């Protein structure tokens, strides 16, 4: 019973590199992302599709063009890779994650 | 361009929105005898004897029911007036003592809710005490299955929150209308056009010097005595997918609803101080029956199908199903309802058992230690009324919540009834009437020369 | 600045009831909403409920209708969650959270410490 | 009713009905002695302290402030009373350059006043310069010999 | 004292003392900085909440409301400041046709405007259209070419 | 800032900057919608009874009283709006006789009007009878035939 | 005491004196007071000798 | 004060409002005098007397 999805599923890249994540496809909503799991409860990273959240590094910024909705993640670190989530209204994704090294 | 055209025209029409307080206006004929404070307080001002309006050509303006602020102004003002009404004439209560009750046996049969209860108070002389019949209504006692309530004896429900205040016996409570006239430098704009979704431009616009009367009767999940819609059925709700937000549905046609407190009753006075008079029911007479309400099945069923078919417009192929109350406290789940000073809580399960695609009856219970409004303080204690009480009203709208969870195409959609924020009682009618200021210093370059 | 406190995780056996509590300090409870979120590794997060302490509206998620229950207590300033007939499916971690402001409820600025729940047999 | 009866009409039509705003910006229907209402009956309880008492006094004095401030801003330019005035100052280079035809033929003030708001201070400064020039010239004219 | 020392005199005599009411129409002996009384000594208890404080503010604001409303009704006809004004409009057919001699010779104004009260609005309308004609003529003269 | 930017300067310099007081004498930075401040955020508790509510109402109404009274004293002499005015009666014999040179060459107003303070009522009476002569002559001109 | 089946009697402040110290009245601007100096007035009808 | 020539006026004492105005005001000021500095009285207990 799912309408929301995101791509790409699993990504492999070294620490410090840059990658691109996107959420799909057409369902309306106030889009958002939640940070990778550090081990405790996660934190926010962005509001309203393109508004970087308070108290967050400047490595995060998204873009929205109707159905097209993408996010770039720059300068990854071993302290920031993990299981992160895409929010549309109430549902969530499929299980996206990024592994370091 | 001769002189390059600098000049000024006095006045000019132009306006911008602005936060600002509003003003009272109520029919000042009958309530000169309510010297103690009440909603449409006698002072206020007498109403305009000649309300006026005009239709404005080609005016394009966008209303917005959720963004405006005057509703919050009222939510503060009416609460403050309530407190100022129960600030004087109120006898703080040295109640909540060791006490005992037992089964009523008015007739040989046992009554349903009352229990004939002894009560040791303070006599006029502070040294002495005496026993009298007194207050018992089952929702307002801390229970136990033993020969007493509570761990033992009993106490009134208030006495670990705050001191309940006695309501003034002489102050009536009846919801007559009130009007609002902004002061000079301000005016009111009215969206006459129909089929309005609560936002976006409204074309048929008229300017009205003073807002029409509104009865701010408090209630939950059943709008009552509200002005009927213009035509058919509408859904004035700020965005449907936002299930957190509440959904308001408004009816063009009315439906009769009647409720009755059938039992005869009489109050007996009790003294609790030098000049402080307590009140509670003294005795009960005649046939015993619970408080209830009556409603016609056919009209209710018709209204629910009309609401269902109209709200289905906002979805392509989905179907709907109603359900009983969500849960939690009696205040929100049951149908909060007021007439004459006595209060009714009514279970609403029977009214929402239907589905989409002759005289129903309701169970109800009385409550008298009311944790009204915020639930944080200012707890009041109404006095019971003599004789029988019957009251009727025109149901006008309902509050709906969209639940949530995971959904799929071809699945069923479920709504539930809920009350909650009392602001959503007054947002129903006062969606009209934006407040606005005019800035009478328009300018534009035009040719001229002084001399 | 604001913080949310929890009593920690409690492990239990399949097929039974359980309770868990949370509280908030500062930014007064009586005005603004709350919500519960489920975190099961190897499975997606699933929103559970949203409670208005002002008047007690509850909007229990349909997939767990009935066996999950919740309430509040204004004077103590707490939030009780209840559920009945737990299974291994509810192997997860639980949180009490709030939105930034009291007009949106889908972008949660403040999260509790987290509280695991495991049942195996 | 002021502009509330003729707000959206043509550019020229607005000038013909500027006058009835004098009643509509001082009296108020309900605050005080008006064109429809007078002092209230139960004024003994209005003069005694009341929740709405401070509201009435606030509304009255706010209306007074509203009228007086703009009336002074109009008066200092020597335009007092004259519902249509005129100044001895040209218009600045920027903002400028919009044709007069549509502005009076079909346009209405509702769509015109927005874009001049941020530049509105400049007109006050230029009018102040005009009044300075006028008063010095008046003083010199007084100097007969 | 104004007409409190000259109310019942002749019409010609009344016009000769129309000025001093300006002090008597705004000052007030006791409410504020009058011609006889300054601020009171025990003002610490004046500023703190008191019944007579509300009385003071009520009286002051009512006087201000009154003066502003009258001066506005006088100003809109172009008569601001001029204690004697003049309008470019005739008088209607009814109510008229009274001989002028008694009105100026020995008449006193206390009994004069009793019968003019019900028709008083009509004079305001006539002066209003007078001002409308005057301002459009001013605009036409302003239109040099 | 009004005179607060150019108070102690020369006599002639003061006349050239009289205009920015109109904003300064009515607005107030903090009482109301100023040139820097608007209505407060938590106005629900300003409207509800509070000490500083009485303070703000008192201050605002006192400012209105002040401006209206002085404007009316200036208005009655026919000098409304005109920042520089002129009256139809020469100066009395006593006090008199001080040379003009120092006063405009180097004096500033601070030390000037202290001696004129006790005689100011005399100037008011002289301007009053001047206005009386002017209005009767206006009536005579009005008497065409 | 006689008071305790009517209302709670209030103690009078020992520091507050009580004397019939006089008070004048006077009206704000826009209002005035008129006085009938003439004698033998029956409480109604015209009064001739009138002073303000 | 001033005497006004030839002024004719009909004084009427029983109709005028200001007497009621002050009848309310003095009572309100009385209350505002005995609202502060006042000790609510828990008197009226058992007492016993005899010839002095
Ligand atoms: C929604 O809209 C509908 C439609 O408008 C509206 O319907 C009306 O609702 C009311 C109830 O809210 C219906 O019932 C009325 O109830 C009256 C009973 O109250 C009496 O007692 C009050 C207190 O005094 C008692 O106690 C003292 C001291 O103990 C004792 O001396 C007295 O004798 C009395 O026992 C009293 O306030 C009240 O009304 C009086 O005072 C008010 C306020 O000053 C004044 O406005 C009234 O005119 C009256 O003077 C009343 O005395 C009931 O009496 C009343 O009228 C019936 O009885 C009187 C007297 O017997 C008859 O003359 C009359 O013809 C009636 O038979 C009235 O019935 C009311 O009936 C509904 N309207 C209709 C048309 O049915 C709803 O209220 C709105 N709101 C909701 C939530 O639905
Ligand atoms: C209330 O409920 C709403 C759902 O009922 C909910 O959902 C949506 O929220 C967004 C807020 O971000 C609203 O805003 C936008 O609405 C447009 C309307 O479509 C028309 O206009 C677009 C113009 O959009 C351009 O600019 C945006 C950035 O602002 C770009 O992303 C976009 O790509 C464009 O560059 C126009 O393109 C549309 O054209 C169609 O064809 C083009 C070309 O193929 C497609 O690119 C496009 O996607 C579309 O297929 C069309 O003419 C919407 O298209 C935008 O995507 C964006 O959604 C929505 O209006 C709103 N939904 C509705 C139905 O109103 C709200 O969030 C909710 N609000 C609150 C406060 O709770
Ligand atoms: C004092 O205030 C309390 C708070 O409103 C009054 O209600 C009591 O509230 C508590 C809150 O937890 C109730 O607790 C019970 O907990 C058990 C735990 O198993 C649960 O099964 C019950 O359903 C309930 O939640 C308590 O029952 C409730 N009532 C009483 C009598 O304690 C309380 O009535 C007030 N008065 C007194 C004398 O406590
Ligand atoms: C309680 O309040 C009452 C009321 O003012 C106080 O006075 C009592 O008032 C009643 C009114 O009827 C008096 O009744 C007596 O009735 C007989 C009938 O034959 C008549 O002959 C008497 O002349 C008188 O009218 C009563 O005497 C009077 N006093 C008392 C002591 O009851 C009363 O004092 C207050 N205090 C108490 C403790 O009652």
Author numbering:
A (entry chain D): 1 to 89, 94 to 105
B (entry chain A): 31 to 139, 150 to 188, 188B, 188C, 188D, 189 to 309, 312 to 321, 321E, ...
C (entry chain C): 1 to 52, 52A, 53 to 82, 82A, 82B, 82C, 83 to 100, 100A, ...
D (entry chain B), E (entry chain F), F (entry chain J): 520 to 664
G (entry chain E): 193 to 244
H (entry chain E): 83 to 134
Task: Provide text from the study.
The HIV-1 Env is a trimer of gp120-gp41 heterodimers that are heavily shielded from the host immune systems by N-linked glycosylation and further protected from neutralization by conformational masking and considerable sequence variability. A glycosylated region near the base of the third variable loop (V3) of HIV-1 Env forms a supersite of vulnerability that is targeted by antibodies originating from diverse germline genes in multiple HIV-1 infected individuals.
Despite poor sequence similarity, examination of the V1 loop regions of each unliganded Env structure demonstrated a structurally conserved hydrophobic core and variable hydrogen bonding and/or salt bridge formation that ensures coupling of the V1 loop to the V3 GDIR/K motif. Visual inspection of the V3 GDIR/K motif in the G300-containing d358 and d526 Env maps suggested greater disorder in the broken sheet structure compared to that of the N300-containing d836 and d949 Env maps.
